[PDB]
Design a binder for these strands. Sequence first.
RNA 1: GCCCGGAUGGUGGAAUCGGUAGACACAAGGGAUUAAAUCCCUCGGCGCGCGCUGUGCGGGUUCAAGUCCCGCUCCGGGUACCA
Length: 860
Amino acid sequence: MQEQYRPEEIESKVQLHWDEKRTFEVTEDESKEKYYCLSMLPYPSGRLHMGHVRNYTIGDVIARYQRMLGKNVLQPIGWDAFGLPAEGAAVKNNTAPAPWTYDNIAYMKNQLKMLGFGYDWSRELATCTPEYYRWEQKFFTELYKKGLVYKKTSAVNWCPNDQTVLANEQVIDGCCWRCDTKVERKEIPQWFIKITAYADELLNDLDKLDHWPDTVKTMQRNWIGRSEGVEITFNVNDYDNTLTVYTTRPDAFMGCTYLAVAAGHPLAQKAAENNPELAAFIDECRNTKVAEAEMATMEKKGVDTGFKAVHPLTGEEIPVWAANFVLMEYGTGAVMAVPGHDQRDYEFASKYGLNIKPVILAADGSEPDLSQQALTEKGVLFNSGEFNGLDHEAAFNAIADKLTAMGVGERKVNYRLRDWGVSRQRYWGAPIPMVTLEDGTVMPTPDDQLPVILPEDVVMDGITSPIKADPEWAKTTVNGMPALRETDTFDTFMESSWYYARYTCPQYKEGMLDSEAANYWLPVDIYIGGIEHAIMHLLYFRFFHKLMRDAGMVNSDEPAKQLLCQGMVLADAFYYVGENGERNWVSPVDAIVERDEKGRIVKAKDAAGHELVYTGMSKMSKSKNNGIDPQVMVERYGADTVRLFMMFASPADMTLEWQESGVEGANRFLKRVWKLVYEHTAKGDVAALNVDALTENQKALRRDVHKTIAKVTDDIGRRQTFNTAIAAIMELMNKLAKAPTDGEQDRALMQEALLAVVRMLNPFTPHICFTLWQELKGEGDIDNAPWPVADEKAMVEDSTLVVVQVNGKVRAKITVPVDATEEQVRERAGQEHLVAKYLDGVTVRKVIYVPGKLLNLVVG
RNA sequence: GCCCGGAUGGUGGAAUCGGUAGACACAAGGGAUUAAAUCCCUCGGCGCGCGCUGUGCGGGUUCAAGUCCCGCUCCGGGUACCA
Ligand SMILES: CC(C)C[C@H](N)C(=O)NS(=O)(=O)OC[C@H]1O[C@@H](n2cnc3c(N)ncnc32)[C@H](O)[C@@H]1O
Ligand SMILES: [Mg+2]
Ligand SMILES: [Zn+2]
């Protein structure tokens, strides 16, 4: 051991040891108890950023902690390798998506290995390889055969000039991010999976996930959006078809003063013939963006269609209006409006002079004031014919029954949850295994033809997909005749919905899963990934587990026991507009910045001379170009310092604004730990510790040692508050550095304490701890060393601290024996001069005593 | 807009079940060795071995509120084709 901590001469050395010994390679060992510690797998974007480092350090801490408790820990890594970013990058750099992606994988693989994360590299997966995607292809055809896949027309962002489809991200400030011309809605036929078929199972099973946080569970309930309501059908005067709507408020049905229909609705299209105002409005509606965000923030607009629907209970003619917020793809493409008791309908009817009829009494039984807003709260009906005086419940059922008996209403459960559209019109994805035959029929690709391989040796024009552009590729032969296979590819979430299961048997060729290996490792003990995925990915992931259960492939009903959603690591983001309207994101490293009195960024320019637009703190990613690569710091201070600093910055679940300030604190701390072990071990082998024999100074220190063990164990195992676990270990090191080390008993206690500090610090900083454990002459490699256990006898307290307050304000703090009574504490508190100061001339009215903790004398 | 979070010294954060506000660190200033590195001292505000005040803003509950309740501002995540 050298005097100086030299990370550069340790980490690479210890990393190689792990590779050669295959330390973190695991099999399905029936002797050991299993623990599956999964971190969400990275997209190979180029380099890691600190977001990645936070995810994979949290993973590694739990992986190493649980290994040290004696478990067989699976910690796998792989690459979610299909995606959009590879297409625009490959074009711009004059490559194809496949080689760009595999380069990134190698680069990042190397970064991950330099951070020292104990992965089972034997189980490494790439989702873009046909050894992987063939199985989801096979699976999709089984899903079709089971009736869980259908095709329908769906809205996509379409560039009419280029004839390309654009993702929501690629549409910016209305126009496209390439050049200046409008982006329009185009309904295009596409493949969906009936996730709504499992909506109730997905909804109900959230009540079983008591180790998933409520942030995630509540977000998921609200996303699925289960409601029990009524579908209602209206005849329309001079139109042969009917209009069907869905309401959850059939109690306010008598205050329905108009209906609102989509721009795509045939009734709107029929009326557009003779109504040029409406025809212009429908044509305008193609500019509406395919994104909920923009559709709720846009100004609510509409035109009268001229068609009058018959209200089935009053018989009154009510106008049908075409509106820009009602859409054909979702639901019936028509809704009913009750402006008196729906605020969105109130705003619409106010703007266009439509009738605002009241039908719900206020809580006191008064007719409501609808002069500033709608009465959204439920109540008794008035102005409702035979339904007057009925409360909410009875009104719901009465109107439902009457509408059912008339044969124009039916009760119905609805979900906000729409089905999962898996079609993408992009090159870099697994091809969808469906086929169109010469005779017009559509069916799954036959099993003998799976996988449908995506060619990698291609030339990209950026506009069209190589497999769509070349008409030879689609040609196959099925049932004896010519067929054309699908040129659309799968949504990239398809590969990330079952990777966790494939990790248990990645080289298995006979099927999707080896169910012996899958049932040994599943379900996942802890799943670690960003709060960004709370809804979309986690929901698909849970849905896909239920599909594989229904194929008899897995045992569990849910895929993951515990879920730890870390906060986002944020950074400042800047851009400038280019010479044809293209956003160009600049890194915060390359941006000269001038700040406010409050610390806010007020001016920003790049090194060249472009006035930058500052968008704010947002998540680190390659898209906004605001990601900080760890590679520079790792080579400066070492991986252990970078890791410790990340874990010490903030509790895992809280979102972090990244800053370089603080790294030295971790670097210095590790130098202090190194020093203390250097000095202790230079003095040689130590005597055995004599417990019953220690002085009161020695007894007190050993209490703090064993209390750190208990607290750190709880802080990692239960709370996952690693920052407080490190702070506890740091405080013990300051105690240990001030302790005497002369006597045989002092050196024996220092041994016990350092053996324990090094093990507690190992999950965080495993390289330095691997080395230090050998210097302290610990048994074996620290990776398999047992986790230290606190000793109840060493932790027993002889006194406790009581806080003394007068009318809630702290006036003194006293040490008192643990077994002390209220009367003794009062008498001891009275002896304090600052307590007596505020008891003079006043009476003690009330006393509050929290045992061993607090006394409040309520005085006046 | 809608759903979910968050805000504590110059800075990141601690306070685990409503009971000590600022643990543990960073930055800064001062001193000690001799520039680096190391080690001490000081460090929420306003006026002292004291007093008041102080956890984004406005109210309220309580013996006691960073914490609970009612109303807000700002900032982040998702909002179904970024992953
Ligand atoms: C399962 C599949 C859908 C995952 C998908 N392939 C994927 O997300 N890939 S990834 O490279 O972008 O990220 C990998 C992990 O790291 C987290 N993360 C990413 N950015 C940040 C950030 N700025 N801050 C904090 N965490 C971040 C992220 O949530 C994920 O758990
Ligand atoms: Mg602050
Ligand atoms: Zn365009």
